[PDB]
Design a protein around this ligand. Structure first.
Ligand SMILES: O=C1CC(=O)NC(=O)N1
Ligand code: NA
Ligand code: NA
Length: 228
């Protein structure tokens, strides 16, 4: 629980140091969530998964994907942006759109399932700008305190002595672009892959191949995007 336990227990060691400026804020978010349950409102994903993106090593990140907030349907959000458990079917519509673009850009077949853990295990941070949502109500936790947390995460990645490519999907993710100005960092941005915005420029955006051409240009290893 993020109210009760310190960052050294909740997240990977690198991340716990990266997030030290927002340690109090993370504990405040735990109190927010406790107050939501006390009031009779729910949240997603499960408490133990809220900070899951920060359980993969900070030092290993090469690409950041940033979306808006977690899936609104109970059983979808797992604490990694856009990912679902490997037994979820049908896929959420945003994920089906992502995979559409993944096949169009990379030429790979459609993935077997919606589990994006291989990307997280290969240096892709699967972040959302806001880390919780009320069921059925997208953007319901906007402006409740998560933005400081994910701003801190980006600033800290950007400051590392390492290349970084950010893929910013949608309007709320785009508000991280000012914190990527330094020469070691580059941001791709597009409309969000949700059906409400995908046709405004998500489809055709080629984010996966472009991120790899940016990494290679900076002297970093490209991501192996291929899902099973
Ligand atoms: O519905 C969703 C899921 C997610 O993780 N990220 C988003 O921006 N939208
Ligand atoms: Na949106
Ligand atoms: Na957004």
């Amino acid at each position: 629980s993020m109210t009760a336990r310190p960052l050294s227990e909740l997240v990977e060691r690198g991340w716990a140091a990266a997030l030290e400026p927002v340690a109090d804020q993370v504990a405040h978010m735990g109190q927010f969530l406790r107050a939501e349950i006390a009031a009779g409102r729910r949240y997603l994903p499960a408490g133990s998964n809220v900070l899951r993106a920060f359980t993969f090593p900070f030092d290993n990140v090469r690409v950041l994907i940033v979306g808006q907030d977690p899936y609104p349907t109970p059983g979808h959000a797992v604490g990694l942006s856009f990912s679902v458990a490997p037994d979820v079917r049908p896929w959420p519509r945003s994920l089906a759109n992502i995979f559409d673009e993944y096949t169009a850009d990379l030429g790979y077949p459609l993935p077997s399932n919606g589990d994006l853990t291989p990307w997280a295990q290969r240096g892709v941070l699967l972040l959302n700008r806001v880390l919780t949502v009320r069921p059925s109500n997208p953007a319901s936790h906007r402006g409740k305190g998560w933005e400081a947390v994910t701003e801190c995460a980006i600033r800290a990645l950007a400051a590392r002595a390492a290349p970084l490519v950010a893929i910013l999907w949608g309007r709320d993710a785009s508000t991280l672009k000012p914190m990527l100005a330094a020469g070691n960092c580059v941001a791709i941005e597009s409309p969000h892959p949700s059906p409400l915005s995908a046709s405004r420029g998500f489809f055709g955006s080629r984010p996966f191949s472009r991120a790899n051409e940016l990494l290679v240009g900076m002297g970093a290893e490209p991501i192996d995007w291929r899902l099973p």
